[PDB]
Amino acid sequence: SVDDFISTETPIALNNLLCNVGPDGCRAFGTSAGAVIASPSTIDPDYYYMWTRDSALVFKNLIDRFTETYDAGLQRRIEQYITAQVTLQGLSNPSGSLADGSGLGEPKFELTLKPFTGNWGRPQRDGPALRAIALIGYSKWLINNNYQSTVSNVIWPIVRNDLNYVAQYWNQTGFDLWEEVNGSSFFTVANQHRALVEGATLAATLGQSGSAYSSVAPQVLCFLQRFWVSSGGYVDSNINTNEGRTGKDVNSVLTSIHTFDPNLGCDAGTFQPCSDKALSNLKVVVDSFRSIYGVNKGIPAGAAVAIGRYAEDVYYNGNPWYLATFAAAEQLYDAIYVWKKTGSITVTATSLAFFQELVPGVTAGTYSSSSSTFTNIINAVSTYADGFLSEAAKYVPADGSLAEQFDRNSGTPLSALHLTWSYASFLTATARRAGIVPPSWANSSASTIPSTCSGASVVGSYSRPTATSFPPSQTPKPGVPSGTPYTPLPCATPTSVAVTFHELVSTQFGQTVKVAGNAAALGNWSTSAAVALDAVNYADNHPLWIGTVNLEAGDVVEYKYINVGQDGSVTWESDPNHTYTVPAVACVTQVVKEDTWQS
Numbered sequence: 331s332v333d334d335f336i337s338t339e340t341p342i343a344l345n346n347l348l349c350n351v352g353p354d355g356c357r358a359f360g361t362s363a364g365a366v367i368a369s370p371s372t373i374d375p376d377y378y379y380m381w382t383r384d385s386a387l388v389f390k391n392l393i394d395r396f397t398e399t400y401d402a403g404l405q406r407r408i409e410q411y412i413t414a415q416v417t418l419q420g421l422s423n424p425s426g427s428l429a430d431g432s433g434l435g436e437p438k439f440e441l442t443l444k445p446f447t448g449n450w451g452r453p454q455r456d457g458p459a460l461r462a463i464a465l466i467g468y469s470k471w472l473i474n475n476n477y478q479s480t481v482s483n484v485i486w487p488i489v490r491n492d493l494n495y496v497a498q499y500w501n502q503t504g505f506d507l508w509e510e511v512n513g514s515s516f517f518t519v520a521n522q523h524r525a526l527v528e529g530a531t532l533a534a535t536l537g538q539s540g541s542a543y544s545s546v547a548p549q550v551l552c553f554l555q556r557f558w559v560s561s562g563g564y565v566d567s568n569i570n571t572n573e574g575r576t577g578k579d580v581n582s583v584l585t586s587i588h589t590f591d592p593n594l595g596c597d598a599g600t601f602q603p604c605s606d607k608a609l610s611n612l613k614v615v616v617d618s619f620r621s622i623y624g625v626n627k628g629i630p631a632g633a634a635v636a637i638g639r640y641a642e643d644v645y646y647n648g649n650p651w652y653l654a655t656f657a658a659a660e661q662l663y664d665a666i667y668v669w670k671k672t673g674s675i676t677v678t679a680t681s682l683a684f685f686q687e688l689v690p691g692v693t694a695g696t697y698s699s700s701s702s703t704f705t706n707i708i709n710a711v712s713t714y715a716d717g718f719l720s721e722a723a724k725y726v727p728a729d730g731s732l733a734e735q736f737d738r739n740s741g742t743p744l745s746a747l748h749l750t751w752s753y754a755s756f757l758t759a760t761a762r763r764a765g766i767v768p769p770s771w772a773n774s775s776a777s778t779i780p781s782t783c784s785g786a787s788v789v790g791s792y793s794r795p796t797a798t799s800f801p802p803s804q805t806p807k808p809g810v811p812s813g814t815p816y817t818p819l820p821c822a823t824p825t826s827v828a829v830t831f832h833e834l835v836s837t838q839f840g841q842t843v844k845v846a847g848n849a850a851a852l853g854n855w856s857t858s859a860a861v862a863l864d865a866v867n868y869a870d871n872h873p874l875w876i877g878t879v880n881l882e883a884g885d886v887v888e889y890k891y892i893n894v895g896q897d898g899s900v901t902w903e904s905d906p907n908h909t910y911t912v913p914a915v916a917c918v919t920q921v922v923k924e925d926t927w928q929s
């Protein structure tokens with residue numbers, strides 16, 4: 331049953347989500363405090379980085395959970411995530427520096443909170459938007475619990491940098507959320523609009539000027555209208571480029587659920603889940619996957635299917651993703667929420683095809699909660715929505731782990747293990763089914779579209795934030811639903827820990843990297859018995875090598891990386907010896923030790 335799946339998966343998803351958060355999460359142990367690894371996977375694929383997007387989406391889920399029920403463990407994690415942003419914002423990186431704002435569009439960082447120096451799809455202009463939305467989310471909590479002073483002191487300078495970035499750079503091309511298409515992206519623009527709306531509201535609450543953000547917001551919304559393909563009834567997810575695709579992409583479904591505000595009803599301007607444009611789009615996007623995946627064979631129209639990112643996808647051969655399949659369920663739960671709350675469903679010419687798939691022959695019109703048409707529709711949509719949950723559930727392993735993808739033919743997990751966003755996507759989709767909605771970000775002002783789009787932007791001021799700490803014990807006001815801090819699920823304490831050595835060193839032709847060390851498993855400083863690392867990952871300005879040795883839990887280890895040529899010659903990295911303490915903590919069975927070569 332779907333209820334069984336939700337029951338069992340919920341605590342596993344939350345646990346696994348939090349295992350990916352530094353400094354102490356079970357699969358992110360020793361990462362910077364507040365850091366969110368996209369995945370513990372270090373090879374095939376290497377996702378052991380911090381993405382501005384992934385971390386902001388994960389923490390928006392956690393901040394929303396924290397808002398529903400105070401949890402001092404979550405708060406500690408939220409505060410840590412926020413202060414890490416002080417460090418990241420200040421970093422010169424290949425996207426640029428903080429001073430002119432350009433550095434804030436950097437997609438990802440080392441989990442040491444250092445610049446990722448390799449070639450990448452940069453900038454990605456959604457990051458500052460999502461980060462702002464996350465930090466504004468916690469700000470509203472702090473303000474509503476009498477800590478506005480902390481917002482102004484610690485948080486606001488961070489949010490202000492990101493808001494200025496959006497207001498300045500929204501009307502320039504960048505890479506999409508899949509890090510592939512350089513242009514103008516639906517998800518990116520829509521969240522940029524949301525951020526400006528929310529940021530103008532926060533400014534005014536703090537007594538700061540929101541004028542720059544409010545003057546630009548409606549122009550961002552104006553431009554968002556250009557992504558709509560009227561002849562096909564769907565969103566072209568990337569414009570200002572010809573990407574060699576239809577533009578039917580879960581991008582647009584992810585947009586709908588992430589800018590959901592039931593107080594906007596079925597507003598099509600902001601692409602609300604129940605809007606006619608969002609529904610029409612959903613059907614088109616779903617349909618693009620119906621005929622092409624082995625796992626969808628023999629499933630009829632009007633029944634849920636496994637869905638991926640976009641039909642043209644070749645990544646790992648192009649497969650369904652858990653977060654995509656969960657996203658479809660979530661958009662439908664969001665629509666159901668609004669229909670139930672308003673007691674009314676409207677079918678239009680635009681949404682006609684979506685509704686006719688579920689209730690064949692239904693006409694456009696408005697149906698109240700008491701009409702049988704309303705009942706046919708809402709029942710069919712609920713079954714369909716649970717069908718998308720159930721479809722993804724079919725391909726979740728017995729242990730409840732959520733990889734990034736499941737195989738288009740066999741449904742077995744592929745790509746990155748324990749993708750943090752997969753867990754969050756499960757948590758949000760099921761929250762919505764439960765009728766738990768996020769805090770509102772908008773009134774109808776935020777949905778008013780100007781008659782013309784001006785492409786207005788504002789050159790902003792950027793300053794390094796300075797405050798890097800929260801006051802202790804910032805507990806809720808009385809009455810507010812409260813509970814004991816979160817505690818991870820129990821495990822055995824490992825006698826052995828898999829230690830992935832993760833080294834940055836530029837090597838020449840045929841050279842191998844080995845780790846020589848003091849412990850027996852590292853060959854007692856013997857160069858011939860040293861442990862060889864994988865040249866896989868070595869990239870332009872990002873020369874990465876990984877090796878995983880089992881070392882005893884609690885053992886203190888001294889090591890040096892050796893550059894071993896083809897000829898079996900050894901060069902030693904400069905002093906000092908590295909010193910690492912292999913952890914002995916419950917649930918910590920694999921760690922990554924991130925290093926750079928000592929010249």
Ligand SMILES: *[C@@H]1O[C@H](CO)[C@@H](O[C@@H]2O[C@H](CO)[C@@H](O)[C@H](O)[C@H]2NC(C)=O)[C@H](O)[C@H]1NC(C)=O
Nearest residue numbers: 500501502503514552553556569570783784785
């Ligand atoms: C910057 O903003 C302007 C206004 O929204 C965009 O210009 C429009 O682009 C669409 C799609 O290419 C055209 O169909 C419109 O005619 C343009 N409108 C106007 C008034 O010029 C522009 O695409 C935006 N650029 C970026 C990179 O975001």
Ligand SMILES: *[C@H]1O[C@H](CO)[C@@H](O)[C@H](O)[C@@H]1O
Nearest residue numbers: 413416796797798799800
């Ligand atoms: C955050 O970190 C900074 C270091 O940049 C300190 O100065 C501050 O006290 C806080 O701990």
Ligand SMILES: *[C@H]1O[C@H](CO)[C@@H](O)[C@H](O)[C@@H]1O
Nearest residue numbers: 888889906907908909910
């Ligand atoms: C790593 O650092 C330790 C200090 O904890 C030294 O004892 C060792 O020699 C290595 O440099």
Ligand SMILES: *[C@H]1O[C@H](CO)[C@@H](O)[C@H](O)[C@@H]1O
Nearest residue numbers: 885886887909910911912
């Ligand atoms: C890891 O931690 C241990 C003790 O906590 C030290 O002995 C070692 O130097 C390393 O820092």
Ligand SMILES: *[C@H]1O[C@H](CO)[C@@H](O)[C@H](O)[C@@H]1O
Nearest residue numbers: 357370828917918919920
């Ligand atoms: C070490 O083993 C534990 C338990 O199987 C995993 O949770 C962890 O990811 C690592 O592989």
Ligand SMILES: [Ca+2]
Nearest residue numbers: 566568569577
């Ligand atoms: Ca396109």
